[PDB]
Amino acid sequence: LIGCRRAEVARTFKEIQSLIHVKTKEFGKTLNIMKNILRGKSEDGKIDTDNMSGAQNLTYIPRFCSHLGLPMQVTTSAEYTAKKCKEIKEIAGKSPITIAVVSIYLNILLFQIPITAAKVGQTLQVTEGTIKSGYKILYEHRDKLVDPQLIANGVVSLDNLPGV
DNA sequence: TATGTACAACCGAACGTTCCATAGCTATTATATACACAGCGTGCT
């Protein structure tokens, strides 16, 4: 996990857990210990940048979109939505995985790709209820979650996003 | 001269299983906090 993060190609805890069979508690405690060790030998003996921070959600979006087979235009829109999604306090505390998945789902229905949430959550191993629950929060601020140029050109209109 | 007799020469070792010794992890209780996930139950169609 540290090695992936240092290379700017960071992965998620679940993705690494798919190969190495270790439950979450031991994983977290070991990671905290090793980070302290690296920091300790960075001062006495660099190590981290803006990347070392846990969330760094923008890095996950390109791979998650690839798993769904979306075009690059949707991926860029998802990155913009996820980047601006941190201004909302009702969602900012959520896990970076959900922040990226809900942003991807918002754009999937914005460009009208026929992929249902039942498969988006099944592909990225995220509960469908969580996806739709988060989508509701990412509906009161849609004007701030869509790139101005895309709406200006005419590629996407905000009336294609269903409203509850 | 002839015949006898005598003499001289030409099984190891690799692997597996059991037996001490030390240290560490596991489980439980309480509490605030918050997220995600897996259930159960009730109304709707």
Side-chain angles (χ1 to χ4, degrees):
Chain A
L1 188 147
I2 298 297
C4 295
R5 276 187 187 171
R6 300 292 176 96
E8 312 286 349
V9 301
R11 304 278 164 158
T12 74
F13 287 67
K14 309 199 181 76
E15 290 174 307
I16 297 162
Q17 269 186 61
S18 164
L19 295 173
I20 303 142
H21 181 78
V22 68
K23 58 190 293 183
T24 306
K25 188 172 176 183
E26 291 81 333
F27 194 109
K29 188 173 284 294
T30 297
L31 180 74
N32 201 3
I33 287 164
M34 279 180 63
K35 288 162 65 179
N36 264 310
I37 300 166
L38 293 175
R39 200 161 296 267
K41 307 218 289 180
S42 169
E43 183 178 2
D44 301 307
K46 39 171 186 275
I47 51 186
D48 65 66
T49 47
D50 296 310
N51 194 5
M52 189 59 35
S53 56
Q56 66 180 205
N57 55 46
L58 290 96
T59 60
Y60 304 146
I61 298 154
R63 179 191 333 127
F64 287 5
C65 291
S66 176
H67 292 315
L68 301 162
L70 317 180
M72 184 63 73
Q73 293 180 357
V74 180
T75 300
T76 303
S77 178
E79 289 179 353
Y80 188 83
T81 298
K83 187 261 184 181
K84 277 294 177 197
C85 187
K86 290 181 74 65
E87 190 267 329
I88 309 300
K89 74 184 68 175
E90 305 90 308
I91 191 79
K94 295 217 173 193
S95 175
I97 288 175
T98 63
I99 294 176
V101 168
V102 179
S103 296
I104 288 166
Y105 181 70
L106 177 140
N107 293 263
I108 278 180
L109 292 176
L110 184 58
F111 297 80
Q112 293 182 150
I113 297 97
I115 299 177
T116 186
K119 188 172 175 64
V120 170
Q122 187 172 356
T123 297
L124 301 179
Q125 189 46 44
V126 164
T127 299
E128 190 256 338
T130 302
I131 289 185
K132 191 160 279 285
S133 177
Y135 170 72
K136 186 175 179 180
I137 294 92
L138 275 72
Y139 182 80
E140 298 259 30
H141 309 276
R142 32 187 165 167
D143 57 353
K144 310 142 79 185
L145 294 199
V146 174
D147 185 90
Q149 281 66 239
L150 270 76
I151 186 171
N153 284 6
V155 177
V156 292
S157 177
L158 272 296
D159 212 41
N160 283 318
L161 276 157
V164 298

PDB file of all heavy atoms in Angstrom, chain A residues 26 93-95 98 125-127 130, chain B residues 25-28 34-38:
ATOM      1  N   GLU A  26      -5.721  -5.502  11.717  1.00  0.00           N
ATOM      2  CA  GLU A  26      -4.275  -5.686  11.653  1.00  0.00           C
ATOM      3  C   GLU A  26      -3.664  -4.848  10.537  1.00  0.00           C
ATOM      4  O   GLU A  26      -2.571  -4.293  10.695  1.00  0.00           O
ATOM      5  CB  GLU A  26      -3.937  -7.164  11.465  1.00  0.00           C
ATOM      6  CG  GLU A  26      -4.251  -8.030  12.677  1.00  0.00           C
ATOM      7  CD  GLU A  26      -5.714  -8.406  12.767  1.00  0.00           C
ATOM      8  OE1 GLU A  26      -6.556  -7.640  12.255  1.00  0.00           O
ATOM      9  OE2 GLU A  26      -6.024  -9.468  13.349  1.00  0.00           O
ATOM     10  N   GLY A  93     -17.421  13.918   4.618  1.00  0.00           N
ATOM     11  CA  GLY A  93     -16.987  12.952   5.609  1.00  0.00           C
ATOM     12  C   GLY A  93     -17.073  11.509   5.171  1.00  0.00           C
ATOM     13  O   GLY A  93     -16.566  10.630   5.875  1.00  0.00           O
ATOM     14  N   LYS A  94     -17.694  11.242   4.025  1.00  0.00           N
ATOM     15  CA  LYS A  94     -17.841   9.879   3.547  1.00  0.00           C
ATOM     16  C   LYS A  94     -16.494   9.323   3.090  1.00  0.00           C
ATOM     17  O   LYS A  94     -15.514  10.050   2.908  1.00  0.00           O
ATOM     18  CB  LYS A  94     -18.854   9.820   2.406  1.00  0.00           C
ATOM     19  CG  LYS A  94     -20.269  10.188   2.818  1.00  0.00           C
ATOM     20  CD  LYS A  94     -21.300   9.341   2.094  1.00  0.00           C
ATOM     21  CE  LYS A  94     -22.698   9.594   2.631  1.00  0.00           C
ATOM     22  NZ  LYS A  94     -23.667   8.561   2.173  1.00  0.00           N
ATOM     23  N   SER A  95     -16.457   8.008   2.907  1.00  0.00           N
ATOM     24  CA  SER A  95     -15.235   7.359   2.465  1.00  0.00           C
ATOM     25  C   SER A  95     -14.873   7.830   1.058  1.00  0.00           C
ATOM     26  O   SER A  95     -15.763   8.092   0.243  1.00  0.00           O
ATOM     27  CB  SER A  95     -15.401   5.841   2.478  1.00  0.00           C
ATOM     28  OG  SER A  95     -14.261   5.198   1.934  1.00  0.00           O
ATOM     29  N   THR A  98     -16.703   5.848  -1.746  1.00  0.00           N
ATOM     30  CA  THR A  98     -18.075   6.257  -2.025  1.00  0.00           C
ATOM     31  C   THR A  98     -18.110   7.609  -2.727  1.00  0.00           C
ATOM     32  O   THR A  98     -18.922   7.824  -3.635  1.00  0.00           O
ATOM     33  CB  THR A  98     -18.887   6.308  -0.731  1.00  0.00           C
ATOM     34  OG1 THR A  98     -18.342   7.306   0.141  1.00  0.00           O
ATOM     35  CG2 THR A  98     -18.866   4.957  -0.032  1.00  0.00           C
ATOM     36  N   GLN A 125     -17.912  -3.271  -5.884  1.00  0.00           N
ATOM     37  CA  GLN A 125     -18.100  -3.860  -4.559  1.00  0.00           C
ATOM     38  C   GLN A 125     -18.541  -2.805  -3.548  1.00  0.00           C
ATOM     39  O   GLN A 125     -17.955  -2.647  -2.474  1.00  0.00           O
ATOM     40  CB  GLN A 125     -16.821  -4.564  -4.097  1.00  0.00           C
ATOM     41  CG  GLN A 125     -16.969  -5.396  -2.826  1.00  0.00           C
ATOM     42  CD  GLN A 125     -18.205  -6.275  -2.835  1.00  0.00           C
ATOM     43  OE1 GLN A 125     -18.512  -6.922  -3.834  1.00  0.00           O
ATOM     44  NE2 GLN A 125     -18.921  -6.300  -1.716  1.00  0.00           N
ATOM     45  N   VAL A 126     -19.588  -2.069  -3.907  1.00  0.00           N
ATOM     46  CA  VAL A 126     -20.168  -1.046  -3.047  1.00  0.00           C
ATOM     47  C   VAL A 126     -21.672  -1.268  -2.992  1.00  0.00           C
ATOM     48  O   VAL A 126     -22.308  -1.526  -4.020  1.00  0.00           O
ATOM     49  CB  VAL A 126     -19.840   0.376  -3.550  1.00  0.00           C
ATOM     50  CG1 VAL A 126     -20.758   1.400  -2.898  1.00  0.00           C
ATOM     51  CG2 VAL A 126     -18.384   0.710  -3.276  1.00  0.00           C
ATOM     52  N   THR A 127     -22.236  -1.172  -1.792  1.00  0.00           N
ATOM     53  CA  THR A 127     -23.664  -1.398  -1.618  1.00  0.00           C
ATOM     54  C   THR A 127     -24.463  -0.446  -2.498  1.00  0.00           C
ATOM     55  O   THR A 127     -24.179   0.754  -2.553  1.00  0.00           O
ATOM     56  CB  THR A 127     -24.053  -1.212  -0.151  1.00  0.00           C
ATOM     57  OG1 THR A 127     -23.351  -2.165   0.657  1.00  0.00           O
ATOM     58  CG2 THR A 127     -25.550  -1.398   0.033  1.00  0.00           C
ATOM     59  N   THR A 130     -26.050   2.445  -0.628  1.00  0.00           N
ATOM     60  CA  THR A 130     -25.119   3.537  -0.365  1.00  0.00           C
ATOM     61  C   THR A 130     -24.964   4.428  -1.589  1.00  0.00           C
ATOM     62  O   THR A 130     -24.903   5.657  -1.468  1.00  0.00           O
ATOM     63  CB  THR A 130     -23.762   2.978   0.063  1.00  0.00           C
ATOM     64  OG1 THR A 130     -23.924   2.155   1.225  1.00  0.00           O
ATOM     65  CG2 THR A 130     -22.793   4.107   0.378  1.00  0.00           C
TER      66      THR A 130
ATOM     67  P    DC B  25       1.027  -8.753  20.125  1.00  0.00           P
ATOM     68  OP1  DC B  25       1.320  -7.941  18.923  1.00  0.00           O
ATOM     69  OP2  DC B  25       0.885  -8.092  21.441  1.00  0.00           O
ATOM     70  O5'  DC B  25      -0.296  -9.611  19.860  1.00  0.00           O
ATOM     71  C5'  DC B  25      -0.332 -10.541  18.785  1.00  0.00           C
ATOM     72  C4'  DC B  25      -1.562 -11.424  18.871  1.00  0.00           C
ATOM     73  O4'  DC B  25      -1.493 -12.230  20.081  1.00  0.00           O
ATOM     74  C3'  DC B  25      -2.892 -10.668  18.932  1.00  0.00           C
ATOM     75  O3'  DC B  25      -3.826 -11.215  18.008  1.00  0.00           O
ATOM     76  C2'  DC B  25      -3.340 -10.834  20.382  1.00  0.00           C
ATOM     77  C1'  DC B  25      -2.720 -12.163  20.770  1.00  0.00           C
ATOM     78  N1   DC B  25      -2.459 -12.307  22.237  1.00  0.00           N
ATOM     79  C2   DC B  25      -3.120 -13.301  22.969  1.00  0.00           C
ATOM     80  O2   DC B  25      -3.916 -14.051  22.391  1.00  0.00           O
ATOM     81  N3   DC B  25      -2.868 -13.413  24.296  1.00  0.00           N
ATOM     82  C4   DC B  25      -2.003 -12.586  24.885  1.00  0.00           C
ATOM     83  N4   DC B  25      -1.788 -12.736  26.196  1.00  0.00           N
ATOM     84  C5   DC B  25      -1.322 -11.569  24.156  1.00  0.00           C
ATOM     85  C6   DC B  25      -1.578 -11.467  22.848  1.00  0.00           C
ATOM     86  P    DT B  26      -5.285 -10.561  17.849  1.00  0.00           P
ATOM     87  OP1  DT B  26      -5.779 -10.887  16.493  1.00  0.00           O
ATOM     88  OP2  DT B  26      -5.193  -9.149  18.281  1.00  0.00           O
ATOM     89  O5'  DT B  26      -6.173 -11.343  18.923  1.00  0.00           O
ATOM     90  C5'  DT B  26      -6.285 -12.761  18.855  1.00  0.00           C
ATOM     91  C4'  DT B  26      -7.399 -13.262  19.756  1.00  0.00           C
ATOM     92  O4'  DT B  26      -6.891 -13.415  21.110  1.00  0.00           O
ATOM     93  C3'  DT B  26      -8.613 -12.332  19.850  1.00  0.00           C
ATOM     94  O3'  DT B  26      -9.821 -13.052  19.626  1.00  0.00           O
ATOM     95  C2'  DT B  26      -8.534 -11.759  21.264  1.00  0.00           C
ATOM     96  C1'  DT B  26      -7.797 -12.847  22.027  1.00  0.00           C
ATOM     97  N1   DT B  26      -7.030 -12.353  23.215  1.00  0.00           N
ATOM     98  C2   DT B  26      -7.282 -12.898  24.454  1.00  0.00           C
ATOM     99  O2   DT B  26      -8.108 -13.772  24.644  1.00  0.00           O
ATOM    100  N3   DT B  26      -6.526 -12.381  25.470  1.00  0.00           N
ATOM    101  C4   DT B  26      -5.562 -11.396  25.377  1.00  0.00           C
ATOM    102  O4   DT B  26      -4.935 -10.995  26.353  1.00  0.00           O
ATOM    103  C5   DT B  26      -5.347 -10.867  24.052  1.00  0.00           C
ATOM    104  C7   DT B  26      -4.326  -9.791  23.827  1.00  0.00           C
ATOM    105  C6   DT B  26      -6.080 -11.366  23.045  1.00  0.00           C
ATOM    106  P    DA B  27     -11.184 -12.263  19.305  1.00  0.00           P
ATOM    107  OP1  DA B  27     -11.975 -13.097  18.374  1.00  0.00           O
ATOM    108  OP2  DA B  27     -10.827 -10.877  18.929  1.00  0.00           O
ATOM    109  O5'  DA B  27     -11.936 -12.207  20.715  1.00  0.00           O
ATOM    110  C5'  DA B  27     -12.396 -13.409  21.321  1.00  0.00           C
ATOM    111  C4'  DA B  27     -12.769 -13.176  22.774  1.00  0.00           C
ATOM    112  O4'  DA B  27     -11.573 -12.868  23.532  1.00  0.00           O
ATOM    113  C3'  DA B  27     -13.738 -12.010  23.008  1.00  0.00           C
ATOM    114  O3'  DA B  27     -14.960 -12.477  23.571  1.00  0.00           O
ATOM    115  C2'  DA B  27     -12.990 -11.063  23.952  1.00  0.00           C
ATOM    116  C1'  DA B  27     -11.886 -11.932  24.530  1.00  0.00           C
ATOM    117  N9   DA B  27     -10.674 -11.193  24.880  1.00  0.00           N
ATOM    118  C8   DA B  27      -9.904 -10.432  24.047  1.00  0.00           C
ATOM    119  N7   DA B  27      -8.870  -9.881  24.638  1.00  0.00           N
ATOM    120  C5   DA B  27      -8.968 -10.314  25.950  1.00  0.00           C
ATOM    121  C6   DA B  27      -8.173 -10.082  27.087  1.00  0.00           C
ATOM    122  N6   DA B  27      -7.075  -9.319  27.075  1.00  0.00           N
ATOM    123  N1   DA B  27      -8.550 -10.663  28.243  1.00  0.00           N
ATOM    124  C2   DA B  27      -9.650 -11.426  28.252  1.00  0.00           C
ATOM    125  N3   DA B  27     -10.476 -11.718  27.250  1.00  0.00           N
ATOM    126  C4   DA B  27     -10.075 -11.125  26.116  1.00  0.00           C
ATOM    127  P    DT B  28     -16.275 -11.555  23.527  1.00  0.00           P
ATOM    128  OP1  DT B  28     -17.450 -12.449  23.631  1.00  0.00           O
ATOM    129  OP2  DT B  28     -16.150 -10.638  22.374  1.00  0.00           O
ATOM    130  O5'  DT B  28     -16.177 -10.680  24.862  1.00  0.00           O
ATOM    131  C5'  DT B  28     -16.302 -11.307  26.131  1.00  0.00           C
ATOM    132  C4'  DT B  28     -16.308 -10.280  27.248  1.00  0.00           C
ATOM    133  O4'  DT B  28     -14.949  -9.835  27.505  1.00  0.00           O
ATOM    134  C3'  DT B  28     -17.127  -9.015  26.954  1.00  0.00           C
ATOM    135  O3'  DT B  28     -18.083  -8.784  27.985  1.00  0.00           O
ATOM    136  C2'  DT B  28     -16.076  -7.906  26.875  1.00  0.00           C
ATOM    137  C1'  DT B  28     -14.962  -8.450  27.749  1.00  0.00           C
ATOM    138  N1   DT B  28     -13.608  -7.882  27.452  1.00  0.00           N
ATOM    139  C2   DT B  28     -12.885  -7.303  28.469  1.00  0.00           C
ATOM    140  O2   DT B  28     -13.287  -7.227  29.616  1.00  0.00           O
ATOM    141  N3   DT B  28     -11.664  -6.813  28.096  1.00  0.00           N
ATOM    142  C4   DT B  28     -11.104  -6.840  26.834  1.00  0.00           C
ATOM    143  O4   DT B  28      -9.995  -6.370  26.598  1.00  0.00           O
ATOM    144  C5   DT B  28     -11.913  -7.460  25.813  1.00  0.00           C
ATOM    145  C7   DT B  28     -11.408  -7.545  24.403  1.00  0.00           C
ATOM    146  C6   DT B  28     -13.112  -7.947  26.166  1.00  0.00           C
ATOM    147  P    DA B  34     -21.034  12.763  15.183  1.00  0.00           P
ATOM    148  OP1  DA B  34     -21.135  14.150  14.682  1.00  0.00           O
ATOM    149  OP2  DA B  34     -22.189  12.144  15.871  1.00  0.00           O
ATOM    150  O5'  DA B  34     -20.617  11.811  13.972  1.00  0.00           O
ATOM    151  C5'  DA B  34     -19.396  12.039  13.284  1.00  0.00           C
ATOM    152  C4'  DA B  34     -19.069  10.886  12.357  1.00  0.00           C
ATOM    153  O4'  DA B  34     -18.803   9.697  13.143  1.00  0.00           O
ATOM    154  C3'  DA B  34     -20.188  10.511  11.378  1.00  0.00           C
ATOM    155  O3'  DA B  34     -19.740  10.648  10.035  1.00  0.00           O
ATOM    156  C2'  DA B  34     -20.536   9.062  11.729  1.00  0.00           C
ATOM    157  C1'  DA B  34     -19.292   8.578  12.450  1.00  0.00           C
ATOM    158  N9   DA B  34     -19.532   7.497  13.404  1.00  0.00           N
ATOM    159  C8   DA B  34     -20.423   7.490  14.441  1.00  0.00           C
ATOM    160  N7   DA B  34     -20.417   6.376  15.135  1.00  0.00           N
ATOM    161  C5   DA B  34     -19.454   5.601  14.511  1.00  0.00           C
ATOM    162  C6   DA B  34     -18.967   4.305  14.766  1.00  0.00           C
ATOM    163  N6   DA B  34     -19.410   3.533  15.764  1.00  0.00           N
ATOM    164  N1   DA B  34     -18.003   3.829  13.952  1.00  0.00           N
ATOM    165  C2   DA B  34     -17.562   4.603  12.954  1.00  0.00           C
ATOM    166  N3   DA B  34     -17.941   5.832  12.617  1.00  0.00           N
ATOM    167  C4   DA B  34     -18.899   6.278  13.444  1.00  0.00           C
ATOM    168  P    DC B  35     -20.800  10.722   8.831  1.00  0.00           P
ATOM    169  OP1  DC B  35     -20.488  11.932   8.038  1.00  0.00           O
ATOM    170  OP2  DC B  35     -22.152  10.546   9.406  1.00  0.00           O
ATOM    171  O5'  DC B  35     -20.470   9.427   7.953  1.00  0.00           O
ATOM    172  C5'  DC B  35     -19.165   9.248   7.419  1.00  0.00           C
ATOM    173  C4'  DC B  35     -18.840   7.774   7.263  1.00  0.00           C
ATOM    174  O4'  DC B  35     -18.958   7.121   8.541  1.00  0.00           O
ATOM    175  C3'  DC B  35     -19.773   7.004   6.332  1.00  0.00           C
ATOM    176  O3'  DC B  35     -19.194   6.874   5.038  1.00  0.00           O
ATOM    177  C2'  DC B  35     -19.971   5.644   7.016  1.00  0.00           C
ATOM    178  C1'  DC B  35     -19.195   5.753   8.328  1.00  0.00           C
ATOM    179  N1   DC B  35     -19.928   5.205   9.507  1.00  0.00           N
ATOM    180  C2   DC B  35     -19.593   3.942  10.005  1.00  0.00           C
ATOM    181  O2   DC B  35     -18.690   3.298   9.460  1.00  0.00           O
ATOM    182  N3   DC B  35     -20.270   3.461  11.077  1.00  0.00           N
ATOM    183  C4   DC B  35     -21.237   4.185  11.637  1.00  0.00           C
ATOM    184  N4   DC B  35     -21.875   3.668  12.691  1.00  0.00           N
ATOM    185  C5   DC B  35     -21.593   5.474  11.142  1.00  0.00           C
ATOM    186  C6   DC B  35     -20.920   5.939  10.085  1.00  0.00           C
ATOM    187  P    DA B  36     -20.078   6.331   3.811  1.00  0.00           P
ATOM    188  OP1  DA B  36     -19.359   6.658   2.562  1.00  0.00           O
ATOM    189  OP2  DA B  36     -21.466   6.799   4.012  1.00  0.00           O
ATOM    190  O5'  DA B  36     -20.065   4.745   3.998  1.00  0.00           O
ATOM    191  C5'  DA B  36     -18.854   4.024   3.837  1.00  0.00           C
ATOM    192  C4'  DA B  36     -19.049   2.560   4.180  1.00  0.00           C
ATOM    193  O4'  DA B  36     -19.456   2.447   5.567  1.00  0.00           O
ATOM    194  C3'  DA B  36     -20.120   1.845   3.352  1.00  0.00           C
ATOM    195  O3'  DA B  36     -19.558   0.739   2.656  1.00  0.00           O
ATOM    196  C2'  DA B  36     -21.178   1.415   4.372  1.00  0.00           C
ATOM    197  C1'  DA B  36     -20.429   1.441   5.692  1.00  0.00           C
ATOM    198  N9   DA B  36     -21.273   1.750   6.844  1.00  0.00           N
ATOM    199  C8   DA B  36     -21.979   2.900   7.062  1.00  0.00           C
ATOM    200  N7   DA B  36     -22.652   2.903   8.187  1.00  0.00           N
ATOM    201  C5   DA B  36     -22.367   1.669   8.747  1.00  0.00           C
ATOM    202  C6   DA B  36     -22.774   1.055   9.948  1.00  0.00           C
ATOM    203  N6   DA B  36     -23.593   1.635  10.830  1.00  0.00           N
ATOM    204  N1   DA B  36     -22.306  -0.184  10.206  1.00  0.00           N
ATOM    205  C2   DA B  36     -21.487  -0.761   9.320  1.00  0.00           C
ATOM    206  N3   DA B  36     -21.036  -0.285   8.161  1.00  0.00           N
ATOM    207  C4   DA B  36     -21.518   0.946   7.932  1.00  0.00           C
ATOM    208  P    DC B  37     -20.460  -0.132   1.651  1.00  0.00           P
ATOM    209  OP1  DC B  37     -19.566  -0.695   0.617  1.00  0.00           O
ATOM    210  OP2  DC B  37     -21.621   0.695   1.254  1.00  0.00           O
ATOM    211  O5'  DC B  37     -21.002  -1.324   2.567  1.00  0.00           O
ATOM    212  C5'  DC B  37     -20.086  -2.111   3.317  1.00  0.00           C
ATOM    213  C4'  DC B  37     -20.818  -3.118   4.183  1.00  0.00           C
ATOM    214  O4'  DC B  37     -21.450  -2.428   5.290  1.00  0.00           O
ATOM    215  C3'  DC B  37     -21.929  -3.892   3.465  1.00  0.00           C
ATOM    216  O3'  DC B  37     -21.659  -5.288   3.485  1.00  0.00           O
ATOM    217  C2'  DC B  37     -23.207  -3.536   4.230  1.00  0.00           C
ATOM    218  C1'  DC B  37     -22.689  -3.029   5.565  1.00  0.00           C
ATOM    219  N1   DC B  37     -23.577  -2.019   6.220  1.00  0.00           N
ATOM    220  C2   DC B  37     -24.174  -2.312   7.453  1.00  0.00           C
ATOM    221  O2   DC B  37     -23.959  -3.408   7.985  1.00  0.00           O
ATOM    222  N3   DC B  37     -24.974  -1.382   8.031  1.00  0.00           N
ATOM    223  C4   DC B  37     -25.182  -0.212   7.427  1.00  0.00           C
ATOM    224  N4   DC B  37     -25.979   0.672   8.036  1.00  0.00           N
ATOM    225  C5   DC B  37     -24.583   0.104   6.173  1.00  0.00           C
ATOM    226  C6   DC B  37     -23.795  -0.818   5.613  1.00  0.00           C
ATOM    227  P    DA B  38     -22.577  -6.302   2.641  1.00  0.00           P
ATOM    228  OP1  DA B  38     -21.692  -7.348   2.082  1.00  0.00           O
ATOM    229  OP2  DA B  38     -23.424  -5.493   1.737  1.00  0.00           O
ATOM    230  O5'  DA B  38     -23.529  -6.961   3.743  1.00  0.00           O
ATOM    231  C5'  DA B  38     -22.960  -7.622   4.867  1.00  0.00           C
ATOM    232  C4'  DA B  38     -24.006  -7.884   5.933  1.00  0.00           C
ATOM    233  O4'  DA B  38     -24.482  -6.617   6.465  1.00  0.00           O
ATOM    234  C3'  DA B  38     -25.250  -8.639   5.444  1.00  0.00           C
ATOM    235  O3'  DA B  38     -25.513  -9.769   6.273  1.00  0.00           O
ATOM    236  C2'  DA B  38     -26.365  -7.596   5.513  1.00  0.00           C
ATOM    237  C1'  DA B  38     -25.881  -6.667   6.607  1.00  0.00           C
ATOM    238  N9   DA B  38     -26.420  -5.313   6.519  1.00  0.00           N
ATOM    239  C8   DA B  38     -26.285  -4.437   5.480  1.00  0.00           C
ATOM    240  N7   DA B  38     -26.881  -3.284   5.678  1.00  0.00           N
ATOM    241  C5   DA B  38     -27.445  -3.415   6.935  1.00  0.00           C
ATOM    242  C6   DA B  38     -28.213  -2.539   7.727  1.00  0.00           C
ATOM    243  N6   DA B  38     -28.554  -1.306   7.341  1.00  0.00           N
ATOM    244  N1   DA B  38     -28.618  -2.981   8.935  1.00  0.00           N
ATOM    245  C2   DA B  38     -28.275  -4.216   9.318  1.00  0.00           C
ATOM    246  N3   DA B  38     -27.559  -5.128   8.663  1.00  0.00           N
ATOM    247  C4   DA B  38     -27.171  -4.659   7.467  1.00  0.00           C
TER     248       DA B  38
END
